[PDB]
Design an enzyme around this catalytic site. Sequence first.
Site, PDB file in Angstrom:
ATOM      1  N   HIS B 351      34.673  -0.835  46.627  1.00 37.05           N
ATOM      2  CA  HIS B 351      34.016  -1.034  45.785  1.00 37.05           C
ATOM      3  C   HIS B 351      32.854   0.037  45.505  1.00 37.05           C
ATOM      4  CE1 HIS B 351      35.148  -5.009  44.316  1.00 37.05           C
ATOM      5  NE2 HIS B 351      35.697  -4.933  45.865  1.00 37.05           N
ATOM      6  N   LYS B 542      21.029  -4.584  35.224  1.00 39.86           N
ATOM      7  CA  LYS B 542      21.660  -4.624  36.504  1.00 39.86           C
ATOM      8  C   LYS B 542      20.960  -4.364  37.916  1.00 39.86           C
ATOM      9  CE  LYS B 542      22.885  -0.773  34.676  1.00 39.86           C
ATOM     10  NZ  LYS B 542      24.488  -0.928  34.565  1.00 39.86           N
ATOM     11  N   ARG B 543      21.238  -4.499  38.982  1.00 43.28           N
ATOM     12  CA  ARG B 543      20.459  -4.292  40.146  1.00 43.28           C
ATOM     13  C   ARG B 543      19.581  -2.945  40.201  1.00 43.28           C
ATOM     14  NH1 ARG B 543      21.159  -8.200  44.737  1.00 43.28           N
ATOM     15  NH2 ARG B 543      19.608  -6.902  45.543  1.00 43.28           N
ATOM     16  N   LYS B 548      21.461   4.133  39.840  1.00 42.23           N
ATOM     17  CA  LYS B 548      21.632   3.602  38.645  1.00 42.23           C
ATOM     18  C   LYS B 548      20.690   4.182  37.498  1.00 42.23           C
ATOM     19  CE  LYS B 548      23.599  -0.909  40.465  1.00 42.23           C
ATOM     20  NZ  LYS B 548      24.901  -0.948  39.524  1.00 42.23           N
ATOM     21  N   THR B 650      30.591  -3.214  35.537  1.00 46.80           N
ATOM     22  CA  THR B 650      31.220  -4.450  34.619  1.00 46.80           C
ATOM     23  C   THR B 650      30.156  -4.889  33.676  1.00 46.80           C
ATOM     24  OG1 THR B 650      30.800  -5.866  36.339  1.00 46.80           O
ATOM     25  CG2 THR B 650      32.781  -5.206  36.454  1.00 46.80           C
ATOM     26  N   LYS B 654      30.704  -5.964  29.416  1.00 44.29           N
ATOM     27  CA  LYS B 654      30.087  -7.223  28.727  1.00 44.29           C
ATOM     28  C   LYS B 654      29.705  -6.953  27.526  1.00 44.29           C
ATOM     29  CE  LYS B 654      29.254  -8.772  33.551  1.00 44.29           C
ATOM     30  NZ  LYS B 654      27.944  -8.917  34.319  1.00 44.29           N
TER      31      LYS B 654
HETATM   32  C1  LIG Z   1      31.070  -2.598  52.076  1.00 46.65           C
HETATM   33  C2  LIG Z   1      31.036  -2.662  50.638  1.00 46.65           C
HETATM   34  C3  LIG Z   1      29.841  -2.068  50.200  1.00 46.65           C
HETATM   35  C4  LIG Z   1      30.339  -1.749  48.600  1.00 46.65           C
HETATM   36  C5  LIG Z   1      29.584  -2.160  47.441  1.00 46.65           C
HETATM   37  C6  LIG Z   1      29.196  -2.769  46.503  1.00 46.65           C
HETATM   38  C7  LIG Z   1      29.692  -2.539  45.315  1.00 46.65           C
HETATM   39  N1  LIG Z   1      29.436  -3.206  44.088  1.00 46.65           N
HETATM   40  C8  LIG Z   1      29.854  -3.161  42.672  1.00 46.65           C
HETATM   41  O1  LIG Z   1      31.428  -3.657  42.541  1.00 46.65           O
HETATM   42  C9  LIG Z   1      31.563  -3.635  41.253  1.00 46.65           C
HETATM   43  C10 LIG Z   1      32.833  -4.439  41.195  1.00 46.65           C
HETATM   44  O2  LIG Z   1      33.871  -3.594  41.441  1.00 46.65           O
HETATM   45  C11 LIG Z   1      31.744  -2.376  40.475  1.00 46.65           C
HETATM   46  O3  LIG Z   1      31.687  -2.565  39.051  1.00 46.65           O
HETATM   47  C12 LIG Z   1      30.346  -1.415  40.597  1.00 46.65           C
HETATM   48  O4  LIG Z   1      30.509  -0.325  40.233  1.00 46.65           O
HETATM   49  C13 LIG Z   1      29.865  -1.593  42.299  1.00 46.65           C
HETATM   50  O5  LIG Z   1      28.774  -0.749  42.649  1.00 46.65           O
HETATM   51  C14 LIG Z   1      28.056  -4.065  44.025  1.00 46.65           C
HETATM   52  O6  LIG Z   1      27.527  -4.660  43.185  1.00 46.65           O
HETATM   53  N2  LIG Z   1      27.741  -4.359  45.532  1.00 46.65           N
HETATM   54  C15 LIG Z   1      27.856  -3.734  46.396  1.00 46.65           C
HETATM   55  O7  LIG Z   1      27.364  -3.974  47.580  1.00 46.65           O
END
Ligand SMILES: CCCC#Cc1cn([C@@H]2O[C@H](CO)[C@@H](O)[C@H](O)[C@H]2O)c(=O)[nH]c1=O
Lengths: 810, 810
Positions: B351, B542-543, B548, B650, B654
């Site tokens: 991710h 978003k966070r 970002k 994501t 939305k």
């Molecule tokens: C150890 C694993 C670490 C990694 C990670 C992470 C990824 N994403 C999000 O995951 C979302 C779902 O795939 C994406 O749309 C987005 O781009 C991405 O930042 C998060 O929201 N939090 C995370 O910690």
Amino acid sequence: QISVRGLAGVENVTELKKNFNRHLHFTLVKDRNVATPRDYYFALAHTVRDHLVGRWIRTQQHYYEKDPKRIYYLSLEFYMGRTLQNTMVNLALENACDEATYQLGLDMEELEEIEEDAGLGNGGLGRLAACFLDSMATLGLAAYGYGIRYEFGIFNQKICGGWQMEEADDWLRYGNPWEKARPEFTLPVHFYGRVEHTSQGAKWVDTQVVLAMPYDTPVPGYRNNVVNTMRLWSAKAPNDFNLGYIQAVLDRNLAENISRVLYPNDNFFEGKELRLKQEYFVVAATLQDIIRRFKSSTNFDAFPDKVAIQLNDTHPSLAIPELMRVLVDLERLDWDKAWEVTVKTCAYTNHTVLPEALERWPVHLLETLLPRHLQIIYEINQRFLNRVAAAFPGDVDRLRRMSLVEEGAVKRINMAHLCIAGSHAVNGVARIHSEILKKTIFKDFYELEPHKFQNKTNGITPRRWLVLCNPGLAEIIAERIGEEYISDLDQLRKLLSYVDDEAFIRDVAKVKQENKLKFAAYLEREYKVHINPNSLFDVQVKRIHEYKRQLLNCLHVITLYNRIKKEPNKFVVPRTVMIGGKAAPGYHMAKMIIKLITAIGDVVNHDPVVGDRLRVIFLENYRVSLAEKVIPAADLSEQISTAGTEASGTGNMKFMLNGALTIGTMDGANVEMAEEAGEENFFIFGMRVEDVDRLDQRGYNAQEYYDRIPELRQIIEQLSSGFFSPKQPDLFKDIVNMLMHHDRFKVFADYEEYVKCQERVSALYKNPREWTRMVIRNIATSGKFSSDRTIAQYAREIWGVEPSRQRLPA
Amino acid sequence: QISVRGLAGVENVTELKKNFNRHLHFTLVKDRNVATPRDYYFALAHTVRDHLVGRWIRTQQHYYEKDPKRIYYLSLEFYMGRTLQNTMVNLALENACDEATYQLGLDMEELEEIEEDAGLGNGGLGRLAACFLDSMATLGLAAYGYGIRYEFGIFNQKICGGWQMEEADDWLRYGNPWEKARPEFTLPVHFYGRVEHTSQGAKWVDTQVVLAMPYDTPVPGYRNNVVNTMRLWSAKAPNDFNLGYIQAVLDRNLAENISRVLYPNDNFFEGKELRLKQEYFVVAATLQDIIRRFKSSTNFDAFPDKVAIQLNDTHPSLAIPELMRVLVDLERLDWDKAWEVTVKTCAYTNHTVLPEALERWPVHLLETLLPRHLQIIYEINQRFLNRVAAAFPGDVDRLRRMSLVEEGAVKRINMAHLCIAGSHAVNGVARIHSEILKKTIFKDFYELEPHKFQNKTNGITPRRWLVLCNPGLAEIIAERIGEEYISDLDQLRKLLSYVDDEAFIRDVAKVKQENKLKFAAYLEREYKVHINPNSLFDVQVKRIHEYKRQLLNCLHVITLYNRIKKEPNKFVVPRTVMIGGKAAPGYHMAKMIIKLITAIGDVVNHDPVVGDRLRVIFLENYRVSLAEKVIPAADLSEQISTAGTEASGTGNMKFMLNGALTIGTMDGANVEMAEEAGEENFFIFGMRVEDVDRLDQRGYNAQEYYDRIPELRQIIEQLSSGFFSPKQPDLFKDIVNMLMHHDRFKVFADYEEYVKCQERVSALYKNPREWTRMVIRNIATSGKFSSDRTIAQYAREIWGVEPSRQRLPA
Ligand SMILES: CCCC#Cc1cn([C@@H]2O[C@H](CO)[C@@H](O)[C@H](O)[C@H]2O)c(=O)[nH]c1=O
Ligand SMILES: CCCC#Cc1cn([C@@H]2O[C@H](CO)[C@@H](O)[C@H](O)[C@H]2O)c(=O)[nH]c1=O
């Protein structure tokens, strides 16, 4: 099946069966292929609880409209046991559910066995609370039990190599269908902080906040459609609490630890902070709830006419300064008027005279934890000691004896002194106990205020302790005299004209024989232990304490064993001696006593010369639901406390009600039971209170008994020498030592007369028919010992409310 | 009311009303005089849950009989939000309950607002889990979500003086009607101990035991009567645990702390023991549950044909050595065969590529906590590096780069390396992200095993993200094309032939206007803040993270403000700029960013020269249920991550679905959205990935932008000089500093092109009609971004199962 368990009407049984299947499907989310007997228990339990709720809602409503005086019973213990069967009995549902569950192909009794005990008590004090609640609802009083919802109750007892092991009692694991969480009535409770003085009076500030969240449990009256409420508080952290982020969240548990665990000490004070927080917690949250309910009826003179607060010993004694605090600091009434209200509201029940059981809180504790309450306590003590001074001028020793504040090593508050000062009535729990209070520990208080002191002899509920545990006996009693006795136990007197009836004699004996066969089978199935059911069942069950003298019973058992070995081919009335009970965790002597009992069982139960003539069984995990099995199966009830130590006892009453004869000292309620049955129908032995006092002032010298009684010397030598502990010859040197040099309870002084009274028991047992007629004479005079009588006396003589046997509409 | 919310048949409405009153009376133990709107919410919630259970039981049964391959989705996060409305939508109950509750004199919408969010996630990763579950059930896959039941979820965000404050999210306080506790399936999980080697193989011994108790939550498919299960484990102490008696009972909380709280870091690794325990916990308990279910169908070759395990990033990467452990140490299969099974069972989804987010566990941690897993990991690494050696002989640098074990300061395990080695498939979450994996961080792994690497572009559920939050828009779409699009989102293409239809243009604009009026009113009622609803709603939610670039948005806002002040009487398209999101607790820069945003709002919102032309609002407590309100009300979606950092995004999806235009960089899924809509229908600006790389190798010098762009220099000086923080002139010196000297994300490099692209947006907004036609062109091409498409691709290309749109019988 049996007529006292209600009607099984076709309409009811069909209705019960569909609600059972509904709960199984919708509440439990199981179907009949995957359900285990535990799921079946829950479906039955939810189906039975549906019948309460309508009644519960109407009862709470009726009280709102009719606005009677409310009784609040404040206790740190509610020893409830199981709720399902009790609920069925009080709603007359028992045979309907039996039938309903039979048709679904289930055994209701096997289902009942799955319910966890609510073990939120230690022994007699917590169990009296439970009988009292059942009696208040049965008598239509507008009465609320208030306590703590402990996550863990009295520990589960396991025996490993003859030693007690303690296990967490995780009674909520599977859920509790009886309670309704009420997070909407959460209340703040304060701790620590400090006191500021203003123009406007005192203010308590910089406090930590613990929230108190209430859980309501329904308490149904007997067949009268009254359903009262037991409200138990749970500790919750506030949400800004501490607010590492992680660590701040984890520390929320330091607040919630208040309601985590019941302290396992019975008749023993431990001055631990966590215990004091528990005490304040229940008191602070309950008083706001009481004031809140009172305001929905500003003028506090009517408070005592709308509210009674009973204190179940000194555990909730902080109710007194807390009521003052609220009245004076928050409602801003003057001292004198708040004080009148307080005294007129509160009453205090004492449950012991044992010095080590009395609550004496170190001042340095109250000072940190409850600085305002301390100020209030000091003020109370000062004004109180001015009344004493005025009434006994120049008597300076009286002033130091009566002070709420004890001087010395560390200063302590005597909490009993506080309760006496702040209550309009103080009572003991049996007549002899009440006289002792007036003659010894509370003598000074009595000369100041004789009109406060009363007696309210304890009782037990004939619903749990007869109908529920002993349906056989209830049924044969009902055949002769009807059902009315269940809520009017005095009616058992009528059984006196059946004492020479041959059919009744045989029916009483037959029931007893059945209960013994059932109990013997429960011993084999659930604990692989083999007992002869024709033997006399000699039972002593209650908490393990030196004052209760389980040791005296041990000495008798060893004596019988030694007599058998001396003359193996002589006939003796065979017995199974059962002894049960929990020891508090840090109480080393109690734990040694348990180990001695099983050590005696190791030797006696494997001697081929003894055969099945003598058996010694230690009953594991004694608790409320184990009492409902062993009590109806008993022949001899052992109530053998040194005279002047057992405030009342209540097991004693359970056994009399259920057809066991009593061997006992003139202690506690034993004195009143014997007086009700006639002393001829009772096996009384040993020192009276007077004799104990004579021996004290002379000096109790145990060596004297050891020198004069060869049977006793042989037991001591056996103990000392490793006869009962071959691998650790010196295992019991603590016991022999205490017995010889520091026995506060004079076990040797009663030994001779106990062994002789015991032979008189075996002799009566040889004549089945006269044994049984004596039983009939006990059962028939047990009426006084109904907690309905106890509660009617509290109602008329302390609370100023009238009981009511009237049905509320359905 | 609206046609997409189901039928309100007289039979259904009458039935719903009686179950509502039943639950109120029997479940909640209230009557209509005492009930508060919260009780009403619960009665509705229980009444709605009754409709699931029958379906839930039949679905679990069907899977037993039909025995299909099962999908297990393992994730540390499930960001569920509210369940009530979603449940109604998927069962077609919405208008019936609306009607039923209307007739009881209640407002259903006011009731829905009382439900707590299940915030068991941080942001996008946890929310994808939730969309995925809804899509698996809608597509009839036999799929189970497994995670931890956190007592506290993502913290509640409060703003105090412009600063974020964190509060415990106590989401269970009032109970959770959606879950069914299943204490009968409790499982032990082990920690610590040590490894013994025997004749028979390795044994893991002297372990601490934590019990894992499961809670099942129903996950209903869309109108197909499938109801799958989300199983979440809770930590419980064993009963002999420690077994002061008191202290031993209180310490039971050290075991239960495992499931107490969700770690609040998003895209940031923290190497804390408690987090690793959480990871092992969910993995150990879930694998036994999986093996157990598989044994009720000894021969593990069929295991991969009966089981797929998806890893939601590396959080549950221990599934790999744990599966090995069980297979080799407990079932005693040989290494090679267990390994084949493992790889064939497991698949891994990455991710992020952000270095600070990757999991690298210190060896000294695994060594103490999971000594056996470490041995297994070492063995895996050794055999893996022998395949690498064999395929690239003599390439010693490759061996150090690919090693599961990192050398240096402290040795660490790279958990991503473990997942790649132990999985048959590895996927990124958007096409550009998947290419980057193949070209950069996982390049070596790709040259070894190209056939493992795939893409599965993310999506979102059109049930929550359209029907549920935006019923107005759903309804007008359904008038033109029917209802089928809800589970076949590609059908929205048909909206393309309505792009020149005047009635449709006006209906799309009208819906948007309604959502804005509703949102503006929610801002005034619930947060006393005043906004102009005719303005363009410019939203970034978003966070909070530097990648970002909320900072880029801030610079634009200040620029607009400075232009207004320069020429006050010039017309500008007015905006409300909303920015929302949580900052992780220890992430100081994120917290400074939040404070800057509100500081900008203090100045801008109280300048009389600005009027209602520009408004800056920080949206508090951004969470799932706040997204369902603000998203439908938005005009401009801000997706402005530096190219190469947002794996997919994501939220972007939305907003496209719900009729907002997008201003964004060519990052993540933005690249595929633009390609679907056509780049003309999208506001793309700034560096591509290629440009970022060119700037890196040359060196990013921020001073260069500050020297050439006077508008930017003025903002920096304003920041430096106290214009936004008059009382602490130097408040933002950290920000200016990072911006000037250590910006890893090149905020200045995109500034010019962002401000210009922004003017192009205002220009299109001046022409309502062409703005709307562009919206129609977005909505109409959003079909690719349905999580149903995503999940069908996982099903066909990774799990080897075929999706099914078939109804199960009712
Ligand atoms: C150890 C694993 C670490 C990694 C990670 C992470 C990824 N994403 C999000 O995951 C979302 C779902 O795939 C994406 O749309 C987005 O781009 C991405 O930042 C998060 O929201 N939090 C995370 O910690
Ligand atoms: C601070 C208060 C301390 C005191 C006390 C206690 C009294 N009783 C019992 O209370 C029972 C109920 O009155 C009596 O029958 C019995 O004789 C008595 O020992 C207990 O079972 N536990 C106690 O702790």
